[PDB]
Design a protein around this ligand. Structure first.
Ligand SMILES: CO[C@@H]1[C@H](O)[C@@H](COP(=O)(O)O[P@@](=O)(S)OP(=O)(O)O)O[C@H]1n1c[n+](C)c2c(=O)[nH]c(N)nc21
Length: 180
């Protein structure tokens, strides 16, 4: 009642990446903490830096517990990502609101029967332009990928004029598979 936390459908892990050239890419990836209730999500979100305030070269990742935010995870190797590319002006205007909306689409299971295809999301803070992406587990599942892309674009509020693409991790690791 007035004392039980509200369990989320999934337990989530927040990851941090800091670009450091002394280390391999994988060694720069670090798990911050995990949560599985509404209350613990907000406690964590409220304690950490907004993405717009991180140094260029850093990432946040939020993934279902047990899935690492890397292509080589069994749940990512056959998958891909719906990519949101932000210009440098949208660092100020949309980065933080887009990322929080992305976080909520994940923990709120916003993609109906296809929320099981979601692995996680990643925001890259970069000088050349930031990126936000939702990662899904199977790039050949056209129906799941397309529905997630349509729900995502509308939850972000992007105008029907704007087009976003989905790329497979196989292609990234070595073009768009889908567009909405
Ligand atoms: C090794 O090279 C990979 C990739 O080319 C590099 C940069 O990925 P990045 O996502 O930073 O692309 P950007 O264009 S946003 O980066 P930048 O050019 O602006 O600094 O980081 C590595 N990388 C990245 N990811 C997501 C993986 C992974 O999942 N697995 C392995 N093994 N490597 C990975």
């Amino acid at each position: 009642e007035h004392y039980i936390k509200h369990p989320l459908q999934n337990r989530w892990a927040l990851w941090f990446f800091k670009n450091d050239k002394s280390k391999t890419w994988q060694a720069n990836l670090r798990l911050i903490s995990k949560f599985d209730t509404v209350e613990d999500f907000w406690a964590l979100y409220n304690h950490i830096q907004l993405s717009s305030n991180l140094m260029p070269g850093c990432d946040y990742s939020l993934f279902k517990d047990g899935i690492e935010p890397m292509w080589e995870d069994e749940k990512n190797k056959r998958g891909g990502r719906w990519l949101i590319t932000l210009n440098k002006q949208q660092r100020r205007s949309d980065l933080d609101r887009f990322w929080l909306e992305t976080l909520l689409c994940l923990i709120g299971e916003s993609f109906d029967d296809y929320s099981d295809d979601v692995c996680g999301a990643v925001v890259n803070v970069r000088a050349k332009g930031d990126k936000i992406a939702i990662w899904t587990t199977e790039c050949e599942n056209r129906d799941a990928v397309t529905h997630i892309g349509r729900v995502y674009k509308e939850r972000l509020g992007l105008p029907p004029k704007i087009v976003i693409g989905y790329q497979s991790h196989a292609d990234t690791a070595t073009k768009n598979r889908f567009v909405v």
